[model samples]
Target: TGTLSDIFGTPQMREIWSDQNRVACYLEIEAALAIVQADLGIIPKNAAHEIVEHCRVQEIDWALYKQKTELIGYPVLGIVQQLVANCKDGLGEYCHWGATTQDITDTATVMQIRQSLTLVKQRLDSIVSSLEHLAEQHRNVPMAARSNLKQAVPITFGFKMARFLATFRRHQQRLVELEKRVYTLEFGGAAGNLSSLGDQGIATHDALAKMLDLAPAEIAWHTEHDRFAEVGTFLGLLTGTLAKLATDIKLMSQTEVGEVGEPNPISCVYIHACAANVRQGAAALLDAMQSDHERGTGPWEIIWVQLPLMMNWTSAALNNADFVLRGLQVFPDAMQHNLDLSKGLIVSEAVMMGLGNTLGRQYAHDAVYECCRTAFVQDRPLLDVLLENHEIASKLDRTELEKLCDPANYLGQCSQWIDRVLSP
Candidate 1:
């Protein structure tokens, strides 16, 4: 939030936007303004040219700059010190001309902001493209939908991703427009006046704007702060949007979903939940493989008068403790089994919701919920619930309801929008 420097802002920016950077840009803009003034025959042409030609970034010395800056308590003093040194004899008088320190510093700040914002727009474009690709690629992939951590319905993996991508794309469009929204040119002589510099000052002001490629301001902005505040609000929104995407990605990659994942370098941290039985099968396999059958030391497995009802949940769960000691094995079978079951449930939700909207709200809700409940309770295929349920079949003509049950039907604008947003 402090700075979007990573997207843009070179080391020079660190230096340029630094007190020194502002000082330098101020000097350059002023010197360029002088050149424009001389072109109009308002100042000495050769002197203005000398100022422009000598606006070297490395010409300023910090020791002398510091001394002058402290005496004046602003960077223009430092700028003037270095700039005047390069002035051709009489050109030194044209130096800052009729401008105040704020004029130069503020203008320079605007220029740096312009560059920084350009980078922000590019980054937004890249991230939006990533989201679009993810949505298009997985639009029909099946997945479970959860509400309040309870299995609610099934949805296509792609449908959920599409919704997220659509949101990101909207934010991206706003960010791209932001460049023109926040960028503006500002300049005024000093203390709010062309009077401070006399009639010739207006001509000088126009000349500066022309040289710097900025629009002329009707009046100065010394205290207007709203423009600055508007821009600050923009920055805050921009940062929050990017961070939101990060949070969503972290959520989708959680182990419970297994629908998406981030590459891990080493061990992962797991959050244990309250479950009565957590053997995970690996515990039994590890103990069996570890023990020497030749020794009477083969561990006493457990007491079960072969199925005692009074078995404590903690004793039943004791095998879970050995998980802390084991190093080597992964339950690929368990992961794949969970993923298969979770995907079907999630994708069903999206289809149900889509159909629900087309049907009357209550009808859609109850129809999908009842079908899902029956599918799980009977262990029947999801398609069968929508196809054979008499209530749903009676309400929905068989043809359309069958289409609604298919995840493939929900690929609305999935590929089109991806191409639209990520066009080459």
Candidate 2:
């Protein structure tokens, strides 16, 4: 339970994204069926038991693995060919009883999805709890709200999390609702005809369900890509939610906005100044990278490396609620440090423009440029430098400027947005 194994990596996610696991599971399903058929009097029990008990990795040859794949376009051909070779007597032909490769493969794909959903759902549930905890913890922590890569209004930290919880909870519901469509039975024989099995089609289909521990659909589905597509759509929902969280964490981690963080006081933060573990842009562009609202990939097919990396952050979470229960770490001091470092030279103009509503955008813009020049030359926090300007100060009071300076106030109507997600 505490370990992760390549074999066990088949948590059976809804998507058939892994061809290797698909092949391995096909072996397991075939073996399981042979044993089941023997019990049902469809095959000799000895053969069934032998195949189930004897199947192992030591006996398989990679050459055979290669040959079968080469002969047939799909990898399943190689795997199936070898599996039958290993089976005793004429029982090897009974390997895929009453079904084609597509039949077994599609059914198994659904099973794995159902299986992996259990693991993923556990994590998703925990995430919801985490958001609730954050909402409660930061309910009063006011921050500035930014929109369109610019400050728009004010918001509270609690409300921000509340909205996240609400939005994610809806995604959770959508995932739950998807099961009806995500996995349908695939019992159709070659070319959608069950002619080879004669009158045994329905009975064998039911028996196969018991063997695989799956529910037999009332009818068959062959061309319906909806099963796979729906499953993919559910994952799309999951990653879409994650994309929002990732985007926010990226912004909150910005140098100018010191309100929120992914790390807390107890744990240490890993700050990357160079390309080591992974590289995003150029080595020199690293400082300029995290200085703004987001990252730099507008291209269509870019890997967007951050998604998979963030998903791998399972160490910080356990069960479905660990991220919420134990809580995700967030460090304000480090955020403040990075925020000032980024905002000092590269992007203080946005801040001046934001707070300068009364100073007129141009005059306010000039004041920002003058102050940024001194701050960059001296290496100082822009907040301190901006507060010193008499002309800006005369236009806006210190308390008024302080509200704009507070990053927490930037959260805008986020808490109220939570209900929109929970609504039907």
Candidate 3:
């Protein structure tokens, strides 16, 4: 009745989005804001240092702050009130001198996102490395390459792993680009006009950005929410890629397919569940990306609900994916076994191509089609039927026919493709 994230998510992620870190980040932003204000001569240096000294998360009385937050409809004012009280020599009055609540809150949110993205990037790198290992280990192992859930041709299992690797590699590239945009600072004053600080607004803002190690925004983004929109789309695409990887593993883990599977539970259900939850969270982010007023009303508030959940689900998905990959069991025997499930029909293209060289392309296709139908009706193997056909038999003997029909022998450039992925 409480929550499923504990069962499906990582503890580190849960902690990252917990009440403790949230407040800690808020305090950190406030401290940084004061320090930057002092640096810019907007506030007394002693007052700034006094406010920064007592800005630790442990200093706040949770019970009292909660009551004030409920009454005031926000936590920042309560935090500022407590922080000012903790300061000595009336220096507490200088706390949050010219900044608005949204300024502090938005910057704090960016800090949280910075930490979350660090974890996400690490997990993604690990997953990509795991895929690299799979590609390296099984680069030449032959298996069925299916389309429409039916075996279409022969392909190395390494090639399959390499394809997934390629997709994830592109995701990694996109992640780098997105990080540059989402980590920018938001330090505009109330109403984003910076009127409280007079001429010192832009200077204080730039100084705060430098102190916090965040990129300075060109102007106040109080109502302009495109940054959040971009982040939402990026996370959506990242999780969607993770889902694509999970879907492939889940499909392969099927009893009939039995090509690949997780090691401990021997099922991909956990990872699949993680993927679904990640997508749900991403959709919520997309919903939040839509804003209403110039100063942002409902939509800005929507992100408060969506961002932490998105981080949690994305973390959960990465944890599951990492486990799945590290313990992935590749049953080359099953892959070989399943490749023969269609009894030479899977390698029909190989046969067709071989016959095409001698019989002309159309006639060879027609001949193979006829043999496939006859073989299917009589419950006979395609190679046996193809050999019995006088036209194909005249062009090629038993050895050539068997070579074309053998799934293992029919993999075209599977090794070369794997090498390309590995090299890239």
Candidate 4:
């Protein structure tokens, strides 16, 4: 509400993770649990129906809800109390029957997480589509490849974009695989045992899971906080991917390199902001992993506290990537111009390899280095230096020398690799 979230949180994220939405999720779990118990005759059917009818955000008194929540250290109590009050003729007595505080709270938090991840999925699909379009259009557009932050070889801009595309694609795959782990129902009663319901406990748990559309876990996870850590770790890695793309875009947008740029000035700058916030939030979430035996002592509180912040940063990062990638500006002519800036030095590997085919690799490297130094000192083309050198001229003809110095001729298998990346 105060600082980074105000600056970076997207409107969609703010809506999905809002306090209203959070309470709505809590109400949903309460309503779903009531319905499940009613189905099993654990709670009266009329009471369950009344609870479901009143389990809406608008039906409750906001002032009293907040007061009760503050009075009781648990948030669900307010909603449960209100739901009971909203019911008629003692039917409210059955509301939240046989449920512990952590059950409803953890399940409700999972509900919120599920909703947020779905939004993230949408953003990722859009980002991947934008990247694919850019990659296809610039599949053969020539550029200089860099190593150790210096020009090292010739490559198409498409190849570079495709590399990032492949990583984002893998991240999407990981997200899909992670859903089963992240979306499980958290429904164990006090002390990791459903002692309240006695005989019908497991049945009620499964039925509640079905009602909420979440998978039921084999055991309680109140203290074993690995699932939350898994989610935070995924967000942490996802932010790293966004940061990598931002780093590349920022570096490429440098005045000297001006080969690629963001559509808006806010694009690259805010990506780093989101990345840093998400990473720190992720670390806090990781620290919230450990707890006591059946339920956490105090560390679990940090999970709920940091989770929204981490997700806020994650959504902002995705929003920034989607915005930037959709309107990404590609300057192929500038890329070609930058490739030529090194005066054939970017193609030194091609020349070295071409010479190495006849003269041994080490000898060829020394020979190319000598010609490169001479070209730099004399302020002449590398082709001119090569042509005038007796050792280089004796090993390769004029056609071979020209071909080695040509950047366009030296992008070996770049198109093939781009094809492989874009195949599916």
Candidate 5:
């Protein structure tokens, strides 16, 4: 492992892609294939039993497997070669059956993807729950809403969180949709025709998929890399969302803004860095989609290199986001202070609307525009500037103007928006 492995990936996620676990997945698929082929009478039932019993990671000689893998420049052949030797009474000959290298490799990769995505979903659920709590707790707390880095208007802190909540909810839906497309069994032989298995190939494929609890592909995808690419793309999209949330939190935790602070600002940095890795890995997988002929040499190899890193980095990013959000500190007072920083200018739209009731809409807008400029130039409050205007002072009472300028009152349907997002 690299020195930065733990820094960029959680121990739990790293283990899922470990050499031991990877070999374990290959052994598992080999055993499943043997059992399924035996059930269909393609291999002897006694041989299948012996193969299954010996198809364990602990039973394999790692040194021998490693030596063979280095010699052959592939791992699955080394694994099957070892398994064939491990079984007793010459039963190991049926171990891999008619399956090819890509068959075992792709299926094992899917197994790893399954484990990794389950962990990711758990973290996403935790993040969503934390955000929901934040939104509900701060539902009425007033804050300044920025556009182009300037305070544009007043918005409740809950409304801001609710927007993020809605986005995560969509991601949750995307995950559910992606699972159906990605969890496919890859059992086709060389050239993707399953020609070696003859008429029993399709049946063996379906049976093995059932045993593995995965969906059977209608046809072999030996050269078609869309499913793997889809998994990469999903991870990319998920990590990108985390980066967006992190960027916002970093901005909010700035010295001048200070509306919220992460448990450690460094957590945001980790999220951004991991997000970049995930996106690049996903992009690299897209290039792998254009493999040559029935099965790729270079493009197929790219999937092996990129998918694990994407899974690892995404896991790290999700863990960081979950930690930051669950322990986040919200400063309602700071939010209020920042809202006051504009000195009533945040509610200029509210003031304009109030004036529009009497003055023509265009006239109200122009009048408020001039008052905003005067308040800024004189370094005076917008209320003071508006009160100084003869038309404004004569038309509206001091009490009514104070009500309009209150940032809390000017939040339009913010509570309703929050409730809509929080609703089931």
Candidate 6:
């Protein structure tokens, strides 16, 4: 029933990696190969036509295909057996001519990756748009910034959203760069030299790549696993960014903090789940990169296991992030309340800077530090404690001290920074 999968992944992404679609990709690649081979005169046109016509996934017998796959321990050969049976003439002999199982299998995986990445990019664009709107909406709203989970200084809520916005924009660029390396077709025979097709080998490879709208590789990548690993790593890094956002949301929604509230309490749960799976999948895919000559007996299969999970879970995480960001409820009043929780201590740096102009930087810092300590011990407002100090009182009046203690006044070019990030 895919109960957990339904919760963690979108149906569109799951469908892309479904058994039916997986086989359909294999058939599509086989058809393209046959058509290309015929165009180059490596195979007869009639044979190519017959093979292509019978490459439909619907023609596959599920029961018998499964049985044969079980016996053969590989799915592509079983699919070819079905194709051969469905063809009218012996022309089916050319159905998978000069192609090895990994050739078909790896190419099919790339096709899936192609479709899945499109979905991921769509969600990313949507999330980035939503973040831009949110950041713009709260551009001047003041909040306390934290370091080590303790109130450190003043910052605008928009500034936080803008920071995330900048991060996602870079992720979008990473996806663009990643496509160049990962979107090539994998079609070299047994040992990846295309030896099976002789002189027509590279021609067939290039033609199939053009037909599929994928890049032609410089050489056979049968055991060169970098492309696939790069995909996993990119997804891993993307999910890590998602996890950071989720962590912030979870922390801000705390009862004590209350600066923001999530639309769903379990929003972070879904993100964290997908992030963990993608991380593990990426690590597994990286480990699988150490293949033996041509292809490792064990590592090649790991791609089958890890790539789908990484793609599926990454889609889920992006979907969840989009939803959460669009529906997030920001409480400016709560932010103000939390900012006041420190009772002007949140703006201590501003007071120090104000006093630094006259008191010398080191003396101003020591004086402000002593006042902050006294205020905390006496449970007094920092303004009252500062006024009690002759040194601080001598330098600044109540109005000047009050202005310096205002969190909003201490945001330090936050609006400018937010505008800069939102610019493009």
Candidate that beats the other on lDDT, 1 or 4, i.e. the better one: 4
Local lDDT at 407 for model 1: 43
Comparison by lDDT, 5 against 6, better one: 5
Q: What TM-score against the true fold does each predicted structure earn?
A: 0.63, 0.61, 0.94, 0.94, 0.97, 0.97
Across 205-262, the per-residue lDDT of candidate 4 in tens digits comes to 9999999999989999998888888888899999899999998998888888898788
Give residue 39's lDDT in candidate 6 (0 to 100).
89
- Candidate 5 lands at a TM-score of 0.97
**Looking at model 3, which ten-residue stretch has the lowest summed lDDT?**
263-272
Candidate 4: which pairs clash?
A: none
Give Cα-based local distance difference scores for all models.
Answer: 0.52, 0.56, 0.81, 0.86, 0.90, 0.89
After superposition, candidate 6 runs with Cα above 4 Å error:
357-362
lDDT of 1: 0.52
Clash count for candidate 6 is 0
**Cα-based lDDT at residue 366, candidate 4:** 93
- Residues 1-424 of candidate 6 have per-residue lDDT tens digits of 5668877778999999988999999999999999998988888999999998988888888899899989998879999988887888688888787899998888999899989989988999999999899999999999989999988989999999999999999999999998998889988898888787898788888999999999999998887899999999999999999999999999999887888887745878889989999999998999998889987889988998888888888888888888899999999999999889878888888999988997899998998999999988988889999898887788789999999888778888999999899885
lDDT for 201 in candidate 5 is 86
Report clash pairs, candidate 5.
none
- List the RMSD of every prediction in angstroms: 21.4, 11.4, 2.0, 2.0, 1.3, 1.4
4 versus 5: better lDDT goes to: 5
Write down the worst ten-residue block by lDDT for model 1.
Answer: 302-311
